[PDB]
Amino acid sequence: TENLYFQGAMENSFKAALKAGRPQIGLWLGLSSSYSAELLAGAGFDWLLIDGEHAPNNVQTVLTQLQAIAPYPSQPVVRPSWNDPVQIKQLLDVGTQTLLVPMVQNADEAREAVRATRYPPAGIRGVGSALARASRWNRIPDYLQKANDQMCVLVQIETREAMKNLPQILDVEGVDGVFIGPADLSADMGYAGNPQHPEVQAAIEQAIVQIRESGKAPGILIANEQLAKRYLELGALFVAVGVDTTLLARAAEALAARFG
Amino acid sequence: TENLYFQGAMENSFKAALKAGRPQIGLWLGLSSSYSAELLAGAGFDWLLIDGEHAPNNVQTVLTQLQAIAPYPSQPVVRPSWNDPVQIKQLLDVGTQTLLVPMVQNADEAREAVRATRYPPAGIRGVGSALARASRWNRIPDYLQKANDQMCVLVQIETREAMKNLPQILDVEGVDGVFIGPADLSADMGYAGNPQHPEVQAAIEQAIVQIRESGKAPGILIANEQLAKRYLELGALFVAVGVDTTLLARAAEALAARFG
Amino acid sequence: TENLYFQGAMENSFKAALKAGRPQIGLWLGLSSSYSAELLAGAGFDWLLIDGEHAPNNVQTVLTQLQAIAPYPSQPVVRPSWNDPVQIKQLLDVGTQTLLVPMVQNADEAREAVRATRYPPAGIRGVGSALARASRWNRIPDYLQKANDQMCVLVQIETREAMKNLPQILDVEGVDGVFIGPADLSADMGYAGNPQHPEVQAAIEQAIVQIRESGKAPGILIANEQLAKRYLELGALFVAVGVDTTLLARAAEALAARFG
Amino acid sequence: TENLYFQGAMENSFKAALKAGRPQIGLWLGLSSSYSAELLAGAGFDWLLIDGEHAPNNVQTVLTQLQAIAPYPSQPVVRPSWNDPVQIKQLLDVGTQTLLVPMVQNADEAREAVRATRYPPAGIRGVGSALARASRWNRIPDYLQKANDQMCVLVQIETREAMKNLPQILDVEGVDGVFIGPADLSADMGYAGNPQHPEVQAAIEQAIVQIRESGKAPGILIANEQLAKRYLELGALFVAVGVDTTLLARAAEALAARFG
Amino acid sequence: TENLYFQGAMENSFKAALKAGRPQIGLWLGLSSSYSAELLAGAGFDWLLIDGEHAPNNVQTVLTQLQAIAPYPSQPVVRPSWNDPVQIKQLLDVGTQTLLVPMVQNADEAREAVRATRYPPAGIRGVGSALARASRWNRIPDYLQKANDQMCVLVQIETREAMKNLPQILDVEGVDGVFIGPADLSADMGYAGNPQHPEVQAAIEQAIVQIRESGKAPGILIANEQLAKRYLELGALFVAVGVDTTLLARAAEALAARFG
Amino acid sequence: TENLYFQGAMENSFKAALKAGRPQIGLWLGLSSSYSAELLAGAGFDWLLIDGEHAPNNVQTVLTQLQAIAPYPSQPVVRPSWNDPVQIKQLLDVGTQTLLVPMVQNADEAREAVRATRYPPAGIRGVGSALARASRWNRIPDYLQKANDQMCVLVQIETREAMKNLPQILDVEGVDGVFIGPADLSADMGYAGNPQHPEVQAAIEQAIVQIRESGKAPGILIANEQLAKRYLELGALFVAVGVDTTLLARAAEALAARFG
Ligand SMILES: [Mg+2]
Ligand SMILES: [Mg+2]
Ligand SMILES: [Mg+2]
Ligand SMILES: [Mg+2]
Ligand SMILES: [Mg+2]
Ligand SMILES: [Mg+2]
Predict the structure, then answer these.
(1) A128, D83, D194, F69: which has the fewest Cβ within 10 Å?
(2) Residues of chain A whose C-beta is under 8 A from some C-beta in B?
(3) Hey, is C177 helix, strand or coil?
(4) By what means is the activity of this protein regulated (chains A, B, C, D, E, F)?
(5) d(CA E251, CA E247)
(6) CB-based contacts of E108: which residues, under 8 Å, 6+ apart?
(7) How many CB atoms lie within 10 A of CB B20?
């Protein structure tokens, strides 16, 4: 069984599902807890986003959430605080295989994101596999030779500039998905973080169509179910449909109010 | 403003509301996190139960949850793992003023629970108020003289033995409320922790009525809203109407299912 | 896949292996770290002992070690600090199914250990399965009805008194295995925690044989490999053959010495 | 009350006091503990500086110190390790509203500090308010529209270069205060971190006068009471008068020595 | 140097100083922080009391405080939450050699405290020295044979019952010192934790004299310096003269007040 | 003794041993635990590398590992995640005196590493010694004047570019040692992280010879003992001969396999 476990651990199931065009339904994790992460790992989502940008996470809390999530069918995705090669290196060594990189503005930045995930000559990933949960402390055989192909890089387009540079970003080898962040986008477009305006919606839907056309996976986070279904219909392949903090806050609030 | 903060830290608002016959709507906290505790402190509940019996909490995590909840209107209640004077002492020194004591079987045990919370001569509470958050490290004036009166002891009746001893338990001075645990009770009655059986409901209803007629506050945890309203109708004064882990688990499950 | 994950979370593989007379090779975990626990879960042991008696562990660190170990074939066993029903309750709710109970002196104490692990009417286990990782927050169907049968209670015999009471201890229903602690035993016999004396070895051998003849599983911790094989030869079924702190300390020492 | 709490939480009282020219007396927090932070929150200071530059703090320990301090009249100020937009973003999302930015050398850097705190179009603050304690997980109404005006940016001038560029820094919109760091300044001036030299004192006092003249708030940390009063007389508006580690170390040392 | 480090780790310097009649000046540690413990270990105290009774400490935080204090001349003493053999065992295995045991009421209880600290046949201390920091994971040679003699047991007398039993308590072999808790004592005597009353002072003075005449070490905690010197004058040998939380709280308060 | 402790703490024994040409045998610490660090501090190594680049460490876990290691003869060395002046500043303030800086490509970068460790005018180290464990909260006398000379900067050459720039790096004042990272080097040379190729070995041995020739200390990490002895023979002065995670994983694996 250990052998079975290790020859099984390497494979990036999320990446494989995106390549095959299987839509993946996700939940955002901002509770920054390995305990609630495990609870939510059993809810039935295809993927769970561990947010190191907008939730108080770091490399150490990412590690314990990956450990919590590990035995479940739900697949972890991790958002670094920015497109930082050092931070990406550290997240990969604790076992991150799927990265959601915020604020990717152009093809150079997208390329930098991809190269941060890959060992030389294909990138600049630093080698420390004996030390790393990524290789299970060198129990995964041929880890150094197998690692690059199982990395999944998803880049966020969150500004008008990023939207303008989209065709070039879609040309970058190793960018597997492009995620539209509606809150940051509408803010950049002058709608103060509220995406429910026709101009923001048009830019979002056009982008999803262009992304899918290139053969890459479109992604988005949207709490409105009707909009989520509509993005799915247009070809989005990684769609986060809620946020743990929001689910908890709204369920508790609605419950308290039912009792006055 | 510091004088003003301290001369109001002392006051037990939950105990005052129970004495006045104001019904208090509660949420159970099993997430064991100061982060989600603060989030839930903003939802509008009268009280929040920090569970040290059935959730992975200790004195240390109780402390950080009390700190998180402090500026909000919601009032903290703490459940020790058992009727243990040592643990009760430690919970009180970190600032706990309202205790929900599990598995109180008779009047002697209820009396022991009360005495654990009170300084001599009215009890056996150990003195270390310079060290303790309870007195805000001695910034609350005359803490040793004001502490006993602001302690609020709630005892759980969870077995047929406990239900038989209810009249005597209710005669114990310092027992402010009596809480029925329907799952433990139904388990003891032969229904395996499933309270939705006529015999269990009848015992619960009779106990609520009996508690309230003796001038004490009846308490209960119940996830079913219609049962909750019925118990409120009957005179229950501290009613927890959901559990954070359950709210979170069920909302995430339903969300995932809506997308298949 | 979630249904499939849950309908297999319930099953105690260690208990099943012991019942079938399959010898189980174990490693003791005193490092008190979810990080090294995961590392050691990949090494190939049948079972890992999370020590809450002689290592700085608590319910909280047990929980994170269980999460770390979960996806691996190695099965977790937990040692509480003593035969304490409250601590046992808390360990079970975080997901512990196999307990190694220290200093069990007689059949009454063995019976108390068994009853602490079982829901009424077969025991006194407190009910809080909505809150607990044990039921995966109620995602395991019919948890309350399936829990008792998957509990595996191992009792330590560590004194001459305990050895005398062995026949009666072995007659206790629910005692699945009997573990001999050679250090505590030799200490009680007047050999100061050093088990390598003929009189101690003879008592150990006789107990192993006696345990196995009664149809129960004999257990032991032994760092000496040849003694371990001998005890296996004699019928021992759960044998811990080293301790993580010792493995680490001795390998580092020998390495340093090779370089002067 | 929840409504009252939220419509009350948004307001930056420290910023309002500085605009009104009310001098604010502060204590530096380097103990990196939510426990001692709460203790010191009751001491009567107008503000408390949570030091992420010279004390072992990070985003997570800042969060728990803010939670500890929250119910007290003392107002939190947070120093990031440097003028880092990513780190500033993370500190703001956990609820930081007043920032003390070290090593601001010129007006460009001061402008970058200001823009890191503001949502587009006024800055580059990333939007993730559903996830954030800053908005109380979206319970503060109109958070996105109200947030920019409640941010308070204080910049540190700590070198001869910064002193030379002071007139231009004072022209930067959104810089509410300018803090002189005497230890770093004297070091840059060739006095090895000791500010008690006439040339350092002259540069400090001249700067305080120039700062106040521009209508912005001068600030400083000084352990000497006589110098503190003298800086206050010259118009300094945010003056930290001690450091928790120093208060503790000196009180304990003086106590031990009194007993030989 | 490792041999040299280990052959000096074993020795209890506090116990040796008490036996020689050298007065030891102490500081109480309620901050529950390994960081402030190290800071205070440099202040010049003979001993530091890590409080597990009235401060939010556990075995885990005791361990990190012992590690922090280790390289300094100040000697650690640990107070368990009560006279509990299980907790005492766990405290000893993490390296505690000097215990201050609260609420010892009679000679039987004093004897139980002593026996909890000693390996058979002189006591009931459980054997797990390979796992324990106490033996430095077996690097201290002949640990099992040297441990008992380096244990130092101090018992608190805190009630009128305890004062009556003092002669018998003092006849217990292994009781190295007797500590009077003036707050608990005055509370029991009817003075509500306020020891500054003639009757309480007289009982304290008489006990100090009685303890010292029996050849044992008298101990006390007292924040008032002149009372401390008086008790020293009378023969007290372990005298804690302040509390870290109090030192910190009072220095910060006085500082704030000097600035209004 | 406090005086003795402080006037003793300042001295960098590792730096002194390198200047005197005493070879130093090391162990890498990737377990990221203050507990196992203390265990390994007693194993007999001259130095221990706390890895903040490839192990999940941060400033806070470095701090607790330094505290754990402090009383032992083994000397701590710390690797930051990169040549980052802010991170270096924070590591120095918690007490790091010996730094191993990864990915130093040229003499400019080496100079930046050196200047990050030194107070003005010799570098850009920020001054906050009252707050810092580095000065023992200002108990080390003349800390500001003594600190620069006790800093020990070791730079890693890990690419073909770094190897080409070696002569210039060796000319940089304050670079005390040059460490070859074989895994990163062979990766850069096209051998995918496996250093056991003649071309990698030749580049390594030539570099060691050039380093020692310049009068600076060569260093390396190598798990093969025969290669370690061979690098030592050529003049390497800081040689790490194993990794804690590897020692633990391989000892546990070999043990499990001996029992089938
Ligand atoms: Mg965004
Ligand atoms: Mg119950
Ligand atoms: Mg034993
Ligand atoms: Mg400065
Ligand atoms: Mg006392
Ligand atoms: Mg490297």
Answers:
(1) D194
(2) 25, 27, 31-33, 35-36, 39-40, 42-45, 56, 225, 228, 239, 241-242, 244-245, 247-253, 255-260
(3) strand
(4) Competitively inhibited by oxalate.
(5) 6
(6) none
(7) 8
Write the CATH number for C243.
3.20.20.60
Cβ contact (<8 Å) for B39 and A228?
no
Residue B28: CA count within 13 A, CB half-sphere: 27
**Token duo for residue A113:** 């994101």
Number of domains in chain E: 1
E156, E158, E163, E164: CA torsion to nearest 10: -110
C-alpha to C-alpha distances, E232 to D190, E220, E224, nearest whole angstrom = 49, 10, 13
What's at D15, amino acid-wise?
A: K
Residue E247 to residue D244, Cβ atoms within 8 A: no
Report the SS3 class of residue B148.
helix
In angstroms, what separates the C-alpha of D86 from chain B's closest C-alpha? 22
Ramachandran area for residue D103 (φ above 0: left; ψ -120 to 50: alpha; else beta): left
> DSSP secondary structure string, chain A?
-HHHHHHHHS--HHHHHHHTT--EEEEEE-S--HHHHHHHHTS--SEEEEESSSSS--HHHHHHHHHHHTTSSSEEEEE-SSS-HHHHHHHHHTT--EEEES---SHHHHHHHHHHTS-TTS--PPP-GGG-GGGTTTTSTTHHHHTGGG-EEEEEE-SHHHHHTHHHHHTSTTEEEEEE-HHHHHHHTTSTT---SHHHHHHHHHHHHHHHHTTSEEEEE-S-HHHHHHHHHTT-SEEEEEEHHHHHHHHHHHHHHHT-
What is the distance between the alpha carbons of residues B157 and B168, in angstroms, rounded to a whole number? 12
Ligand 2 center to residue B106 CA distance, Å? 16
Nearest to F87 by CA among F60, F105, F123: F60
Tell me which of C35, C48, C54 to substitute to probe the interface with F (most F C-beta atoms closer than 10 Å). C35
d(C-alpha B204, C-alpha B215), whole Å:
17
Q: How far apart, in whole angstroms, are the C-alpha atoms of residue D43 and residue E249?
A: 7
Gap between the Cα atoms of A73 and E227, Å rounded = 67
Are D2 and B44 in contact (CB < 8 Å)? yes
| Amino acid, res. A77 | V
Q: Which amino acid is at B139?
A: R
Residue with tokens 């505690």: E96
- Please report residues of D whose CB lies closer than 8 A to that of B64: 34, 64, 67
**Experimental structure resolution, Å:** 2.2
| Other CB atoms within 10 Å distance of the CB of residue C122 | 15
Distance CA E119, CA C132 (A): 38
Ligand nearest to the Cα of D195, by number: 4
The one-letter code for the residue type at E164 is K
What residues in A contact F187, CB-CB < 8 Å? 119-120, 127, 144
Per the CB < 8 A criterion, the answer to whether D52 and D81 are in contact is yes
C-alpha to C-alpha distance for F161 and F158, rounded to whole angstroms? 8
Type of residue numbered A260? G
Task: Name A244's Cβ contacts closer than 8 Å, sequence gap at least 6.
Answer: A27, A28, A29, A30, A31, A36, A40, B248, B252
Please indicate the experimental technique that yielded this structure.
Answer: X-ray
Q: How far apart are CA B229 and CA B225, in angstroms?
A: 6
Q: Which of D100, D26, D25 is nearest to D57 (CA)?
A: D100
* Ligand 4 centre distance from Cα of residue F196 (Å): 48
Burial of C234 (0-12, 13-18, 19+ CB in 10 A): middle
For the packed helices D244-258 and E244-258, what is the interaxial angle rounded to 10 degrees? 110
> Under DSSP, is residue C260 helix (H, G, I), strand (E, B) or coil?
coil
How many residues appear in chain A?
260
Cβ F119 vs Cβ F127: under 8 Å: yes
Closest CA to F123 of D42, D65, D192, E204: D192
Q: Are D48 and D133 in contact (CB under 8 A)?
A: no
Q: Which domain holds residue B12?
A: 1-260
Joined tokens for residue E260: 């209004």
